[PDB]
Design a protein around this ligand. Sequence first.
Ligand SMILES: Nc1nc2c(ncn2[C@@H]2O[C@H](COP(=O)(O)OP(=O)(O)OP(=O)(O)O)[C@@H](O)[C@H]2O)c(=O)[nH]1
Ligand SMILES: [Mg+2]
Ligand SMILES: [Mg+2]
Ligand SMILES: [Mg+2]
Ligand SMILES: [Mg+2]
Ligand SMILES: [Mg+2]
Ligand SMILES: [Mg+2]
Lengths: 18, 353, 208, 81, 50, 101
Amino acid sequence: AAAAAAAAAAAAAAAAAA
Amino acid sequence: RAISRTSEDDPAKHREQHEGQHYNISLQELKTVFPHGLPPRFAMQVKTFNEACLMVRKPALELLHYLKNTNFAHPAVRYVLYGEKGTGKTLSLCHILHFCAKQNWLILHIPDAHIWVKNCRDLLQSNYNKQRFDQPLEASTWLKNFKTANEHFLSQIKVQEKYVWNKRESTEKGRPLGEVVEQGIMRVRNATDAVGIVLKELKRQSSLGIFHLLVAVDGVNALWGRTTLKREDKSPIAPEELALIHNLRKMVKNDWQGGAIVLTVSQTGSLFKPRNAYLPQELLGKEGFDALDPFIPILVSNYNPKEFESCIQYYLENNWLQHEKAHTEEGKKELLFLSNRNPGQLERLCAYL
Amino acid sequence: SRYGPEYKDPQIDKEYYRKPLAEQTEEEKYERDFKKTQLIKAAPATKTSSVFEDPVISKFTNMMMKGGNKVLARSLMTQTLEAVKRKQFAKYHAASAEEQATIERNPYTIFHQALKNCEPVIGLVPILKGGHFYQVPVPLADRRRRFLAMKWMIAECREKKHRRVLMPEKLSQELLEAFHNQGPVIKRKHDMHKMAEANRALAHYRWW
Amino acid sequence: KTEADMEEYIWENSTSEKNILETLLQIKAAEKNLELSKEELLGTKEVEDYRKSVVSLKNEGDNENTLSQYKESVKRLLNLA
Amino acid sequence: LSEYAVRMSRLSARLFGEVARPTDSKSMKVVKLFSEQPLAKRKETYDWYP
Amino acid sequence: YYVDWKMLRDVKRRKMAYEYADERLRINSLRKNTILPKDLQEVADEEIASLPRDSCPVRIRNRCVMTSRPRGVKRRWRLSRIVFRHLADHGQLSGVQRAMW
RNA sequence: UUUUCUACAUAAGAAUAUCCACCACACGAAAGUUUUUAUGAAACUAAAAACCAAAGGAGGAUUUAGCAGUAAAUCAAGAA
Ligand SMILES: Nc1nc2c(ncn2[C@@H]2O[C@H](COP(=O)(O)OP(=O)(O)OP(=O)(O)O)[C@@H](O)[C@H]2O)c(=O)[nH]1
Ligand SMILES: [Mg+2]
Ligand SMILES: [Mg+2]
Ligand SMILES: [Mg+2]
Ligand SMILES: [Mg+2]
Ligand SMILES: [Mg+2]
Ligand SMILES: [Mg+2]
């Protein structure tokens, strides 16, 4: 049911993850 | 030289320094006090000796001493007997049971709760209770033992309700409870609803000074545990789903006055519990221990040296040890070691000896 | 035979080792035992120093055992001894002082006596002579006889019981019936004895 | 967050809290004391020994000394000595 | 089982980079198929013979 | 020369099966999935059954590499049982020995 | 029946071809029928359910194995 928003991009750029 | 049966028998007047002595009980006493089950091994003991002799133990003394000072004005107090397998819990429940049948109370006894949760031939469906199942056989048997249990009080009670057994049959207020009990015995079909009705009317009428209610449920963990019995869908059913359990739960809630509930948490008959778990919160689980409220956790342990020597002497007095070398000190050291002076184990070792 | 022939059997008896000082030849003998630097087989799990264990009961236990179950066979033996015990305690309290002096309540002595009564005196071996097999009366060793007793007991109380009926029940029954000599086991013993008299002439064919 | 999701047993909003408050409500109704408060009941030392005993029982687990704590706290609470 | 537990789990998968949304037992095979080296591609297979 | 015609066949099979591995995988992705609609999956079905029959891996046999024996092979050395013994018994297989215990 | 089922390590509860008037029904289904699942391009292959519950009531002549951690019974792993 519930679809929660996880930001891949924010934590990505921040931790050198993208 | 040791003392065994030499205690003078007064279930109420039992003295702390009379520890480890066997008081005697009659046979008609056995028929009136225990119409319900007595532990099979001990039943064998009695039938074999023709004498029912029972040893006084420290937890039994303690729990009787908490039943002397009972203030019936206060809400019902919950006691719990716990211990390792074969340590004498049910005989310590029986000590109480017959002492309180001698003070003339209303005795409500369930020999094993587990029997209601497991191995049921007939499982009946009832929507009267909103999707609940009933056990005609078990209910009938319990009622038939309850009838012989207390006769005096079954005439004295006046039931106040309008009760419907069938569209063609009913019982209306002002009836002695014996009539309800036997009305449920005769008709096996509704016997469960009869047990539940007996119970809730017992709890209602327990506020008066006419009722002193000792409720003994052995293996209480069978109430909040997991159930083996199944629907035709093969899907397992909760213990909630059972009429007998649902009603026997209400009897432990301590909502009422004048009564006392003495409980025993069990292993030997259990379901889904490991064999080495004797501890109350493990057997009862989260549901059990949380819904069991503040209670008194009485520990039941193995024979100490004196208890042990007294039991051995009691067996020698009945000449139940038939081994030539069992009269030596050697034999005692060996029985002590092999049994670890555990009562059930000692009985097993002396049975074939 | 993970033991070389060098290894002697152990003597488990405690009484033997506890009270040595009164016997010369035996002092010399077990002196020669240990001082010979003699190797000893490790005492078996079955056998104990227990004051309570009867080697005959243990043998019987074993002959009852199917598969690898000691636990189950020791169960059935234990239960049978208890059952004989309680059957005689039943027969004791429904009796009168005379019969209370007579009746035996030790299940061990009952077991033993019931086996002694059931053991055959004489036996039969087939012997081939002139292309025919004659059955011939043969004297038996002690061990062979005890064996025949125990095996006959167990064979009967396995075979002839009704399937509803448990083993310690039927076995306690037959133990008590063989105590008093009226058991079917004893009838078997007699069939042997009678077959051995019928053939007594043929006792000449035996060359040993 | 569900209470069944918890790694610890917190005394606040418990079931044992409601069972105790009902037990003491009925004890006050029996003794004919008309004094009724949650602050008064739960503020006592007894219910505090019950906090400690039941939190040590649920978190630490079944034990000899922990059931001795239960023994003592429920002894004091129910007036039996 | 709660909603809290499920939210937590969803977060765990999303974080560690495992499958986010709930899938069948039958569909997970797909992931397996791309997680691995397809059988005919292993050096033990195409390079078997000298 | 591979020792036998059969071995030749097998070499070819392993080559083709190497070549089409990507196609086969990509398609059997669709095929093995519950999430996609059946209408895609039937077309994808004919798609993978279109592929050359010698490209599918189940048609491969692990054969003895020297002697071409189809079975009695030990996977680790890719050797027939017979050839394996023949090498080991002259002690040309390092760390292999007869077993006593 | 030294059995079958469930819990569970080895002290439990129940079942128990027969009850009785009447079915129903014990042990035995590894076999078949249906539906699923695994592997695979391909299911005829293996596995799990539900239904079904048959012959078998300890075996003629004749025969095999075993000398101790063996026979017997039970559990697990591997090779391809
Ligand atoms: N005379 C006498 N015998 C006792 C006493 N307690 C235990 N025994 C003996 O030991 C056996 C133990 O019986 P139980 O009371 O059922 O023991 P238990 O703790 O209920 O055992 P489980 O039901 O397995 O948990 C009895 O059958 C008696 O033979 C006692 O208080 N007096
Ligand atoms: Mg008990
Ligand atoms: Mg060639
Ligand atoms: Mg192949
Ligand atoms: Mg069947
Ligand atoms: Mg089977
Ligand atoms: Mg497929």
